[PDB]
Amino acid sequence: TLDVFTKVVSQADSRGEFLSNEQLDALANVVKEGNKRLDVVNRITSNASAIVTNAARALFEEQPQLIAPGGNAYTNRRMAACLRDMEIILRYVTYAILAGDASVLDDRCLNGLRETYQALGTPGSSVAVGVQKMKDAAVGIANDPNGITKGDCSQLISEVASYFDRAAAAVG
Amino acid sequence: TLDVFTKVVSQADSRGEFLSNEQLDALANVVKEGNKRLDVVNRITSNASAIVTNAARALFEEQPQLIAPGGNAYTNRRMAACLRDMEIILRYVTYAILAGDASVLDDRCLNGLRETYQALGTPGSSVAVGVQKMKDAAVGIANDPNGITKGDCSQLISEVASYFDRAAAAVG
Amino acid sequence: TLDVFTKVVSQADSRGEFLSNEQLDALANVVKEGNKRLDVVNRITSNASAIVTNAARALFEEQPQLIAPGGNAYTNRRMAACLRDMEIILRYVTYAILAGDASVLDDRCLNGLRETYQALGTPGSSVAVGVQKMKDAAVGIANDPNGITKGDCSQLISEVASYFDRAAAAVG
Amino acid sequence: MTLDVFTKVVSQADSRGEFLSNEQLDALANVVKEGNKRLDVVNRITSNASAIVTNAARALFEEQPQLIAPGGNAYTNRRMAACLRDMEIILRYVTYAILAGDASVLDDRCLNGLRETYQALGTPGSSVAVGVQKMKDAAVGIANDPNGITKGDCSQLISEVASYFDRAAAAVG
Amino acid sequence: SIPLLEYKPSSQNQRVPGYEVPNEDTPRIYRIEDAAYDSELKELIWATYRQVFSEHVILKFFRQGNLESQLKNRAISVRDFVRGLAKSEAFKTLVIKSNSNYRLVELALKRLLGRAPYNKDEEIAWSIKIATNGWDGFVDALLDSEEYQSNFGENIVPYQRRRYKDRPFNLVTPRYGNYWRDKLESERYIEGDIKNFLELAKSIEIKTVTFTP
Amino acid sequence: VKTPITEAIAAADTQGRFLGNTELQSARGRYERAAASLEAARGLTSNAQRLIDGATQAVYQKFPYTTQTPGPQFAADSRGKSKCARDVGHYLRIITYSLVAGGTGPLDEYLIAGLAEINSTFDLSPSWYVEALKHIKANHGLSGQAANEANTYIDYAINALS
Amino acid sequence: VKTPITEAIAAADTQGRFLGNTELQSARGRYERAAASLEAARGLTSNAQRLIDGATQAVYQKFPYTTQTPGPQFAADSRGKSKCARDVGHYLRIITYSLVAGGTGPLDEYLIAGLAEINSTFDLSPSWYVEALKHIKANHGLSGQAANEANTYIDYAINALS
Amino acid sequence: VKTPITEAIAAADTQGRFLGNTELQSARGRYERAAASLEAARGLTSNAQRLIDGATQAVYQKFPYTTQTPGPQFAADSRGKSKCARDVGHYLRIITYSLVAGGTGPLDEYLIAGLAEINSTFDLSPSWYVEALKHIKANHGLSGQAANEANTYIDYAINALS
Ligand SMILES: *[C@H](C)[C@H]1/C(=C/c2[nH]c(/C=C3N=C(/C=C4\NC(=O)C(CC)=C4C)C(C)=C\3CCC(=O)O)c(CCC(=O)O)c2C)NC(=O)[C@@H]1C
Ligand SMILES: *[C@H](C)[C@H]1/C(=C/c2[nH]c(/C=C3N=C(/C=C4\NC(=O)C(CC)=C4C)C(C)=C\3CCC(=O)O)c(CCC(=O)O)c2C)NC(=O)[C@@H]1C
Ligand SMILES: *[C@H](C)[C@H]1/C(=C/c2[nH]c(/C=C3N=C(/C=C4\NC(=O)C(CC)=C4C)C(C)=C\3CCC(=O)O)c(CCC(=O)O)c2C)NC(=O)[C@@H]1C
Ligand SMILES: CCC1=C(C)/C(=C/C2=NC(=C\c3[nH]c(/C=C4\NC(=O)[C@H](C)[C@H]4CC)c(C)c3CCC(=O)O)/C(CCC(=O)O)=C2C)NC1=O
Ligand SMILES: CCC1=C(C)/C(=C/C2=NC(=C\c3[nH]c(/C=C4\NC(=O)[C@H](C)[C@H]4CC)c(C)c3CCC(=O)O)/C(CCC(=O)O)=C2C)NC1=O
Ligand SMILES: CCC1=C(C)/C(=C/C2=NC(=C\c3[nH]c(/C=C4\NC(=O)[C@H](C)[C@H]4CC)c(C)c3CCC(=O)O)/C(CCC(=O)O)=C2C)NC1=O
Ligand SMILES: CCC1=C(C)/C(=C/C2=NC(=C\c3[nH]c(/C=C4\NC(=O)[C@H](C)[C@H]4CC)c(C)c3CCC(=O)O)/C(CCC(=O)O)=C2C)NC1=O
Numbered sequence A, B, C: 001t002l003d004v005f006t007k008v009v010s011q012a013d014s015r016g017e018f019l020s021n022e023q024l025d026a027l028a029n030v031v032k033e034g035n036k037r038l039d040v041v042n043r044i045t046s047n048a049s050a051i052v053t054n055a056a057r058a059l060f061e062e063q064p065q066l067i068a069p070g071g072n073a074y075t076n077r078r079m080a081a082c083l084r085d086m087e088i089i090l091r092y093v094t095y096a097i098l099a100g101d102a103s104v105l106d107d108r109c110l111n112g113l114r115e116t117y118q119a120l121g122t123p124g125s126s127v128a129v130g131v132q133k134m135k136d137a138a139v140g141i142a143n144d145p146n147g148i149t150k151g152d153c154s155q156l157i158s159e160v161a162s163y164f165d166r167a168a169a170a171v172g
Numbered sequence D: 001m002t003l004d005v006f007t008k009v010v011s012q013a014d015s016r017g018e019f020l021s022n023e024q025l026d027a028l029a030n031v032v033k034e035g036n037k038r039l040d041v042v043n044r045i046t047s048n049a050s051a052i053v054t055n056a057a058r059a060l061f062e063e064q065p066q067l068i069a070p071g072g073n074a075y076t077n078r079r080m081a082a083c084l085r086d087m088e089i090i091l092r093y094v095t096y097a098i099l100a101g102d103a104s105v106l107d108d109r110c111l112n113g114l115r116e117t118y119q120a121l122g123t124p125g126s127s128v129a130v131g132v133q134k135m136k137d138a139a140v141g142i143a144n145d146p147n148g149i150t151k152g153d154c155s156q157l158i159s160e161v162a163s164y165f166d167r168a169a170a171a172v173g
Numbered sequence E: 001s002i003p004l005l006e007y008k009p010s011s012q013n014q015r016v017p018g019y020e021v022p023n024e025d026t027p028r029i030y031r032i033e034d035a036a037y038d039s040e041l042k043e044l045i046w047a048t049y050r051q052v053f054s055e056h057v058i059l060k061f062f063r064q065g066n067l068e069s070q071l072k073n074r075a076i077s078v079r080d081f082v083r084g085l086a087k088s089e090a091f092k093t094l095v096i097k098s099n100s101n102y103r104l105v106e107l108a109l110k111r112l113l114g115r116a117p118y119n120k121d122e123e124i125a126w127s128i129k130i131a132t133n134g135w136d137g138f139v140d141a142l143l144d145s146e147e148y149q150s151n152f153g154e155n156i157v158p159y160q161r162r163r164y165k166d167r168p169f170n171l172v173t174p175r176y177g178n179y180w181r182d183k184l185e186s187e188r189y190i191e192g193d194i195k196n197f198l199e200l201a202k203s204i205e206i207k208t209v210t211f212t213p
Numbered sequence F, G, H: 001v002k003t004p005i006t007e008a009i010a011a012a013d014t015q016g017r018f019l020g021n022t023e024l025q026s027a028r029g030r031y032e033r034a035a036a037s038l039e040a041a042r043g044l045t046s047n048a049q050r051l052i053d054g055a056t057q058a059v060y061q062k063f064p065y066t067t068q069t070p071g072p073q074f075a076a077d078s079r080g081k082s083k084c085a086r087d088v089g090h091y092l093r094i095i096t097y098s099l100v101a102g103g104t105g106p107l108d109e110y111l112i113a114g115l116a117e118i119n120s121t122f123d124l125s126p127s128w129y130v131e132a133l134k135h136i137k138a139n140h141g142l143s144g145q146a147a148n149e150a151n152t153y154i155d156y157a158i159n160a161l162s
């Protein structure tokens, strides 16, 4: 579990020198964009369950053979696997957005997902489409201004689109 | 853990259609041969400990190097391994006879026996021979009529000879 | 005549979908870097006439038979002919940097130019030795900083030189 | 159970089943204003945590010399260490209760079985109370003095700390 | 003393919730407080032997009389009872003479915690503690772990948590390791070899004379 | 899956002992029960198109708003009503599965595990399928011992919905 | 209960160490936040009779069958509508509790624990209270940053219902 | 490492739930604390050569025998005094690390873990570095609230030595 701060700390520990001035200048900018980071993370967990069901319908339409019999997500028990576990991507993504680093995302939700499926028979490609259907809606939920002050966070939202693309490409 | 019934159920679940008429005609025959299934299974467990010791002496004569020193079954602890264990084949075989299916036999007593011996040094072939010495005596115990009504069960006894041959060939 | 703004419309019309949010974040960077280009473009057009003769101080000095009797730049209207349209390269390269996409460049300097240049009898390869000499002088002026606030202009400059390389490829 | 000053009012207002009254929100707004003084007092104790354990230990083991004398309950180096280690555990659960502003965390961890556990142990309860009462006059005195800080009178807040040690002392001896 | 080596956890069938509501092939995970009888406690005392040792090593000589008596009395909690079998020198000769340190991590997680190890780097992580704390100290740190005490609870026999399609662990892991087997082949006593006569051949003195012409 | 044959097997496995007469008597209780249960399954498979037509129309008359309210969850559009006959057509399979298997195994493994988990998410009210099964409970037309056997699995599914 | 003061306490308890600067910075994040949250609670307590009247009438117009269908679960009789204002009157207490406590503690301990457990039994559809809270989300009349903080708890309850 | 951002993360991980408002308020508390802590780190990095010269000479005047006694452990030879400025030069890095990280993470992971373990072996008395840090505590020259934040990590290291 690493931060943006402890990323710089563990990197400066390996060289064994003091923290340089521009690194403190860069981390002072993260303090200024710190309140926008709580704007984006609070907006996802408020719309957490609404974006799980909405991305599930768009997945199970466009691959109909899954909930069809013989499919990997056919029975009601497995189905509650491939639906409730779509939160677990979002659980570890919004951890990484609030952390600002992809270390927590890597060793919990990324380290064995492409591992565990060969023994399970779950198709890797189907999951990728699913997380990639979360990404265009999770970015779109945090994009629109309604009752918040207007700001610019395109340099910060691209981190969120990178986090889903890190989660997608490591499996499929 | 599967039956003959749940074999048809899980097969009919994958196609997603109702149960056909001849499948119910075939399962009605299993009801009629259900009382012959009870007698054969019951007989084995009555002669369980007598067929473990009798197959052990015929094994340890015809391969004398096992209980000879340096052998894999030389010491008593090891010896009480190879002897008691011989019940565990019979424990999972008579489960499969009463189940009428080889699913319980496969994932408990067959799934790692050919696995576990390379790390153990036990000879796989010798174990296979021992189970094949159970098979000609277990069939011969259930074959002879003494104080039971005469019937025909050659189509059912061949399932038992198939179960030991499934247990034998998966190891050696 | 296409643009950066209009070409990301035109392929988006061909697929018939609404413009995605990461295309708008792409165009937001185009607006962001827009101010520098106007500044960059103005320096080329203000030194437009100074580039052409300084390229003609080497286009003819390196291949000196061209103005010597017999070459196709020999007589005086023939000489004024390769200053009449040495600048038309600069007239449309500056249109390409303004639009930000080379689709207005390829209709005028790249479309039928290689056809006339074997119909007339002019050396086609002797143009692209000196259009490279324009690019060596164009990016020297556009990068040089005098009385201007400093920001990285690496992205704009590399693909300014890509327009000259497209201008040399379809003539040679 | 772990309770706040806020969840004290919440669980009390839950039992009556009515909305939160206006003066309760007026009282909790005052706790927000004294919230920065609460971090002043809690940060000053844990910075002087190990210095006040050793200093209260010497004043205890002088004035009752029979403890580290042979036959005493804190004689050998093992029991001694346990007693020494423990004196932090009062301070661990006291400064939890100061930052909580409530004595619920102090009660069910460090108070619920201390007067219980000593009859089976043979440790003297009265002596322990003295040890904690020697912490209290030094912990109040550490947070009292002002060096390089804004001066305000929280005397209404320091009396909560003197109440917390007196709650911890009187429940054992 | 020193905090443990930091290990990354992999994806594992028990690490997450799974929505199986009681399946049949799942264990019968026993409790001490149900019993109220002579009868129930003999079955419960047998299933804990079946977990920690294994069925094959469940012989009467190994079994402890004092421990069995305690469960009936109820003086000792079943979680306090498993400490008897893991720190039993009848158990210790069977598994600690024959298994390396990294296998000793894996076997204790596979039986006592009833879980597969996550990765390789965490058997390295638990390894330092065992060498310093002993075998008893590593077992003591495993049973007083927060993970063991919350999920098994206080009085429930060890078992495997989630095995939708997963090998039984007794079958999956041998009592001893692949290393200790190779010693048994090395000390097999081959018959009719030149190697056992090598220590006799050097004791015999031989003098050789060569003539050149 | 759960079957009173395999219930006798998995119980004897944990004790590590042979199939005694305790586990053996559980088998013939399953066997002679099938003869009153297999023609209880034949009464449902022959009447397959009747009941899924009957229960679907019974739901609409019980809840008249579910045909009018606009939403994916409801049956306002055609693909809702196409998904209507799929769902109750999926219930009658498992009841015929669990009647033939003789236990509540297929009802456990294929229907009710996570059934209360999904209905919170897709806002499918379970009282919809309660009235759907209660039409099948009254319209099956089975008589005698076989009817009793087919009647419990309908009621076992209802208590799992609630 | 869960409070980011006590979240800092219970985390430092399991490690067995003093309140360092790690747990201390979690306190002033709760403190400052209260000044935008306490008048977020004052906006709800002053408008108490408005919202429970507003959300109850919003439920009936959204679901017109719940006033007509005969059953205890519904609001056909008078004691149903008496239990209607009790339920949404019970929701607004915990939102004002969890705004004042500053965490999702009282929402965890008093509302959503076993909330999906009871609604399967009494066949109370959770989509009833979804539309009830969404009326409060649009008509609470609060403004600014404080209102936004107050709102999350409305949306945190909705995701717990679904 | 320990950071009150990651303290909020690892706490929400074991419960297996999303980042609610409980963990979110722990973030802001770290954020606005940095603005009184980053120029608290700038006061130490600018005065780097002053303090390691000051604390090393303060140790020799406090303990005059440590310059005279013959031994590797002491500072009699030149390589002892070369290892003197290395050690206190290593302390000031972690204090600037733990001020910038905002928690006692780098003090835990890099300094005090096994710090009482090595000093028994190399017979380095911890009271040497107590007086070394107490010179830095009085002579770091920082003022205001930011200075106070820096001071706690100095006092947190002293209690770890004792
Ligand atoms: C010291 C001021 C007094 C004193 C103390 C003393 N304590 C013990 C032994 C133990 N004390 C505890 C205490 C706690 N456990 C908790 O969980 C908490 C709350 C966080 C507390 C306060 C425990 C568990 C033990 C025993 C085992 C262990 O510590 O690990 C002893 C040891 C006595 C003996 O014979 O063993 C002593 C001597 N002694 C005095 O005289 C003082 C009044
Ligand atoms: C989902 C988009 C796809 C899909 C999934 C599906 N998964 C399973 C079963 C399991 N999935 C896991 C996954 C994890 N465990 C972890 O610890 C983590 C990281 C935190 C993950 C991602 C596990 C352990 C299982 C086994 C059962 C369990 O959940 O405990 C199934 C069931 C398959 C079966 O045969 O039983 C399915 C269907 N299915 C799809 O179609 C999607 C493409
Ligand atoms: C010493 C000359 C070199 C060195 C040592 C060093 N090792 C580690 C980490 C570990 N060491 C072990 C070693 C053992 N484990 C065993 O069970 C046994 C036999 C009983 C041995 C010899 C293990 C498992 C580890 C992993 C972590 C652990 O302590 O439990 C470290 C710490 C490194 C780190 O934390 O990353 C060090 C310093 N390393 C050197 O630099 C010397 C060259
Ligand atoms: C953890 C609890 C918490 C939250 C949620 C929080 C949010 C928060 N967002 C703020 C500002 C802001 N937040 C945004 C966010 C955005 N504007 C846009 O148009 C974008 C689409 C979007 C980012 C994607 C902006 C633009 C501001 C302006 C003020 C600033 O820069 O902070 C501020 C400044 C102070 C104030 O508003 O009173 C707060 C409080 N503060 C807290 O303490
Ligand atoms: C439920 C399915 C199942 C089976 C069958 C199984 C077998 C199994 N037999 C083992 C050992 C053994 N297996 C044997 C058996 C034999 N060795 C011989 O010499 C004979 C040739 C042969 C018997 C015919 C013996 C003697 C041991 C003890 C060897 C040792 O301790 O090193 C071991 C390792 C130690 C143990 O726990 O006892 C396993 C895992 N485990 C399973 O989970
Ligand atoms: C679970 C405990 C249990 C057992 C063991 C059991 C067995 C059993 N086997 C029976 C019949 C029978 N069992 C057999 C079996 C055979 N005859 C042969 O010649 C073949 C070699 C062999 C089959 C391979 C036959 C032929 C009958 C005649 C009656 C019938 O069809 O059931 C019957 C009919 C009723 C009776 O005998 O009183 C019983 C009770 N019933 C039980 O409740
Ligand atoms: C608007 C875009 C555009 C361009 C650029 C263009 C070029 C162009 N240059 C031409 C001739 C020419 N082009 C050149 C140029 C050169 N020859 C040389 O010796 C030099 C190497 C080189 C100049 C660097 C010369 C000297 C002629 C006259 C050749 C002739 O009359 O045969 C001709 C044929 C006759 C003409 O109308 O003048 C065309 C069409 N036409 C276009 O419509």
Ligand SMILES: CCC1=C(C)/C(=C/C2=NC(=C\c3[nH]c(/C=C4\NC(=O)[C@H](C)[C@H]4CC)c(C)c3CCC(=O)O)/C(CCC(=O)O)=C2C)NC1=O
Binding pocket: C035, C036, C038, C039, C040, C042, C142, C143, C144, C145, C148, C149, C150, C151, C152, C153, C156, C157
């Ligand atoms: C159409 C009339 C027009 C022009 C010409 C124009 C140019 C222009 N260039 C600007 C900035 C700038 N322009 C440059 C350009 C460069 N710096 C380098 O070192 C590179 C070599 C070079 C690009 C190749 C840079 C770096 C800035 C910094 C400010 C900014 O990002 O806009 C700005 C910002 C506002 C200002 O300067 O007052 C202006 C006005 N604005 C106008 O309205």
Ligand SMILES: CCC1=C(C)/C(=C/C2=NC(=C\c3[nH]c(/C=C4\NC(=O)[C@H](C)[C@H]4CC)c(C)c3CCC(=O)O)/C(CCC(=O)O)=C2C)NC1=O
Binding pocket: D036, D037, D039, D040, D041, D043, D143, D144, D145, D146, D147, D149, D150, D151, D152, D153, D154, G024, G025, G028, H145
């Ligand atoms: C000797 C008796 C005494 C005390 C106790 C005292 C404390 C004290 N702390 C203050 C401020 C403060 N105290 C803190 C302390 C902190 N905030 C955090 O979030 C951190 C976790 C923590 C430090 C670790 C802060 C942030 C302020 C803001 C005002 C200031 O800078 O002084 C002030 C400013 C004036 C006032 O509050 O009325 C007082 C009075 N003054 C006194 O006369």
Ligand SMILES: CCC1=C(C)/C(=C/C2=NC(=C\c3[nH]c(/C=C4\NC(=O)[C@H](C)[C@H]4CC)c(C)c3CCC(=O)O)/C(CCC(=O)O)=C2C)NC1=O
Binding pocket: A057, A060, A067, A074, A075, A076, A079, F056, F059, F066, F072, F073, F074, F075, F079, F080, F081, F083, F084, F085, F086, F087, F088, F090, F091, F110, F111, F118, F122, F124, F128
């Ligand atoms: C094999 C056993 C089995 C069954 C029966 C089953 C049902 C089931 N029906 C669903 C949705 C649905 N179920 C229905 C059915 C209905 N809604 C109505 O309006 C009508 C009242 C009613 C039909 C009479 C509809 C329309 C949907 C789509 C709802 C949505 O997409 O939100 C869903 C969630 C999404 C899906 O994959 O399609 C499941 C899991 N799943 C199973 O594994």
Ligand SMILES: CCC1=C(C)/C(=C/C2=NC(=C\c3[nH]c(/C=C4\NC(=O)[C@H](C)[C@H]4CC)c(C)c3CCC(=O)O)/C(CCC(=O)O)=C2C)NC1=O
Binding pocket: G056, G059, G066, G072, G073, G074, G075, G076, G079, G080, G081, G083, G084, G085, G086, G087, G088, G090, G091, G110, G111, G118, G122, G124, G128
């Ligand atoms: C403190 C948080 C809290 C809430 C909110 C809560 C609700 C709650 N409402 C209930 C029943 C009820 N809930 C309602 C409410 C409604 N039904 C309708 O028809 C309307 C659509 C809707 C109101 C808008 C009614 C009428 C009953 C009685 C139903 C019955 O008795 O079967 C019940 C079961 C019986 C009871 O004790 O009264 C609970 C537990 N319990 C809690 O602990």
Ligand SMILES: CCC1=C(C)/C(=C/C2=NC(=C\c3[nH]c(/C=C4\NC(=O)[C@H](C)[C@H]4CC)c(C)c3CCC(=O)O)/C(CCC(=O)O)=C2C)NC1=O
Binding pocket: H056, H059, H066, H072, H073, H074, H075, H079, H080, H081, H083, H084, H085, H086, H087, H088, H089, H090, H091, H110, H111, H118, H122, H123, H124, H128
């Ligand atoms: C990055 C943070 C960091 C620090 C600061 C650190 C200090 C440290 N200093 C050590 C020894 C030492 N430390 C000193 C320093 C002193 N002794 C004296 O006599 C003087 C009073 C004093 C200096 C002012 C000396 C001379 C040794 C060698 C002692 C020996 O070899 O026994 C040792 C043990 C052996 C070693 O690897 O060199 C450590 C671990 N280690 C760390 O990882």
